[PDB]
Amino acid sequence: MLKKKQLTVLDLHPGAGKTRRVLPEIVREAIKKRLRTVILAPTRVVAAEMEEALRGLPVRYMTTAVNVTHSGTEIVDLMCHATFTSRLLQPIRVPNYNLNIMDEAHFTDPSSIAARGYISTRVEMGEAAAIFMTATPPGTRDAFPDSNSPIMDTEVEVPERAWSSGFDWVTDHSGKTVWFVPSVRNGNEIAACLTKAGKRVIQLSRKTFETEFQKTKNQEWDFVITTDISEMGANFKADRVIDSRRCLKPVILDGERVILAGPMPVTHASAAQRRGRIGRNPNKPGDEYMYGGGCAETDEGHAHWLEARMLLDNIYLQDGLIASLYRPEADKVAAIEGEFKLRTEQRKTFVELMKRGDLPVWLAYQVASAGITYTDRRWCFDGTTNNTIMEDSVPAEVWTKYGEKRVLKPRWMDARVCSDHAALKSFKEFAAGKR
Ligand SMILES: COc1ccc(C)cc1NC(=O)CN
Ligand SMILES: COc1ccc(C)cc1NC(=O)CN
């Protein structure tokens, strides 16, 4: 695996021990061979689980998620996928790692796709080796892979709204259920319905995942209601998954705005990872997977692959060369390579809008490429009437940094800035000049 110009897909089935058994063996061999190695975790939660898997091995944990005192001598780094891509974009020296290991390498967030494109390009150049660890590589067509224990798979109508009758199987269950919903707002409705029926519910989404995931260990629960973020190595002591088989797809319309289309079917990879939360214990056969729809390749034309091109166009590789997406996921976007390359100062603005600004990549790019500086929020108010953001059926309003009350009406409308109460609160703070 560890030889230059090799990219290995470690595609053992979910729960086969890729992280707890195989990874430490790879790391030991890498240190022996004096390979400068990076290990990429999808989330802080997985970063902390990896520290447990790798304990006593000399690894530099480049995250506050791990409380360890480093020796200073480590040649293995561990960081999150997004941290890798972030450091590549910034004017910070990132070592040219001899061995690049990506755990949960199916993750479809723009920074993960970009990281795979950069890494696979270095491997193609003959510069490096890589290992992509996932049960579900890009373009997998298998929603029902092998498991540690037999799974009961049932196609059934799954509620996506509060219900009064017709779904007794949902609440009659005495075990623990992980329920994949397509959005935070949809999870809120299902969660309230379950709570009203006497169930103990924990809700997980990207912004809340580290804090709320700990509740799955510290409190008794009946249901976890989660978005797709629990596809990325989240482990539960559960005996049932309920899968809507639905997701939201961010779509760029007429190069001009981003909508959250759907809900629509998940990919086969997503479905397999959702199901893969259960069947993990060879001593507990007959975990249940209840699924409410079919799969489709909804990653085609999904904004995250164009956003990944925006990131890669702005990462130095060698002279004017630009890293390609990882070949198996490269046709998910129609882009001209280099079309999003920004000059140094617009690039710094683009980076700051994504990090400090917490804006979606697409929206950060529209603002930075327009020659707007990071602190200039006039664009949050001067859009068309149809760009008016609504909050409880009234136009959303903020006090501008000038002290003027204005309707939020961004020049570029990205539905991700107002997809739920938390998102809109963050965007209101941004529009007001508060970060
Ligand atoms: C929302 O945060 C980001 C936005 C954009 C990029 C490329 C990375 C990050 N996150 C990190 O760098 C976390 N350490
Ligand atoms: C020669 O190109 C390839 C052939 C096959 C595979 C798996 C990857 C690449 N290259 C890339 O994916 C560059 N990002």
Give the integer Cα–Cα distance in Å for 43 and 231: 11
- Whose alpha carbon is nearest atom 3 of ligand 1? 355
In angstroms, the CA 228 to CA 270 distance is 8
User: Which residue's CA is the closest to the ligand 2 atom numbered 8?
Assistant: 327
Q: What spacing in Å lies between the alpha carbon of 124 and ligand 1's midpoint?
A: 26
Nearest protein CA to atom 7 of ligand 2, as residue: 327
H or E element in which residue 136 lies: none
Beta bridge mates, 103? 133
Question: Which segments are annotated as binding site for ATP?
Answer: 12-19
Residue 213 structure tokens: 């995931």
Measured in whole angstroms, how far is the alpha carbon of residue 124 from the centre of its chain? 25
Taking the C-alpha atoms of residue 76 and residue 87, their distance in angstroms, rounded to an integer, is 16
Per residue in 187-219, is it b (16+ CB within 10 Å) or e — as a string? bbbbbebbeeeebebbbbbeebbeeebebbeee
| 11 Cβ neighbours under 8 A, 6+ residues apart | 134, 135, 136, 137
- Tell how far CA 201 is from the center of its chain: 22
161 to 102, 186, 249, 321, 419: CA distances (angstroms): 37, 7, 19, 49, 17
- Tell me which ligand sits closest to the C-alpha of residue 83: 1
- Burial class from Cβ neighbours inside 10 Å (0-12, 13-18, 19+) for residue 282 reads exposed
- Listed residue (253, 256, 258, 289) closest to 271, CA to CA: 289
Identify whether the C-beta of residue 222 lies closer than 8 Å to the C-beta of residue 200: yes
Which ligand lies nearest the alpha carbon of 85?
1
Helix (H, G, I), strand (E, B) or coil at 203: strand
Radius of gyration of the chain (CA): 22
Atom of ligand 1 nearest to the CA of 86: 7
User: Does ligand 1 lie within 6 Å of residue 120's CB atom?
Assistant: no
Question: Per DSSP, which regions of 64-150 are E strands?
Answer: 76-80, 99-103, 129-133
Structure tokens at 351: 């980076």
Confirm if 119 and 109 have CB atoms less than 8 A apart: no
- What is the dihedral sign for C-alpha 295, 271, 81, 426? positive
SS3 121: helix
Alpha-helical runs (H) found in 197-317: 209-213, 215-218, 268-275, 303-312
Exposed, middle or buried, 108 (CB in 10 Å: 0-12/13-18/19+)?
Answer: buried
- CA 125/CA 168 separation, integer angstroms: 57
Technique of determination = X-ray
In angstroms, how far is the first alpha carbon of the chain from the final one? Answer: 45
Q: Six-digit token pair at 142? A: 């298998």
The residue whose CA has the least distance to atom 3 of ligand 2 is 327
Question: Is residue 111 within 8 Å of 102, Cβ to Cβ?
Answer: no
Q: How many CA atoms lie within 13 A of 145 on its CB side?
A: 27
The atom of ligand 2 lying closest to the CA of 330 is: 12
21-37: buried (b, 16+ CB within 10 Å) or exposed (e) per residue?
ebbbebbeebbeeebeb
Final resolution, Å: 1.4
Which residue's structure tokens are 């006497």?
Answer: 198
Say yes or no: do domains 7-133 and 152-291 share a fold.
yes
| 223-226: strand order across its sheet | 151-155, 287-291, 240-243, 177-180, 223-226, 201-204
> Regarding beta strands 397-399 and 405-407, do their DSSP bridges make them parallel or antiparallel, or are they unpaired?
antiparallel
CATH topology of domain 7-133: Rossmann fold (3.40.50)
To test the pocket of ligand 1, the residue of 355, 356, 359, 362 to mutate (highest count of ligand atoms within 8 Å of its CB) is 355
Give the residues surrounding ligand 2 with Cβ less than 6 Å away.
7, 117, 120-121, 124, 324-327
Q: Is the CB of 36 under 6 A from ligand 1?
A: no
Feature table: binding site: 12-19
Give the phi and the psi of residue 288 in degrees, each rounded to 5. Answer: -110, 140
Question: To which residue do tokens 């623990």 refer?
Answer: 176
Beta-strand pair 246-253/257-265: antiparallel
DSSP class of residue 229 equals G
Minimum-distance ligand 1 atom for the alpha carbon of 351: 5
The CATH code of the domain at 152-291 is: 3.40.50.300
Q: Is the CB of 113 under 6 A from ligand 1?
A: no
Which residue CA neighbors atom 14 of ligand 1 most closely? 83
**Atom number, ligand 1, closest to the C-alpha of residue 114:** 7
How far away, in angstroms, is 175 Cα from ligand 2 center? 44
- CA 88/CA 354 separation, integer angstroms: 14
Of ligand 2's atoms, which has the minimum distance to the CA of residue 120? 14
Which of the 8 DSSP states describes residue 417?
Answer: G
Longest CA–CA span in the chain (Å) reads 64
CB 60 within 8 A of CB 78: yes
* Pairing verdict, β 59-61 and 76-80: parallel
Q: Rounded to whole angstroms, how far apart are CA atoms 428 and 435?
A: 10
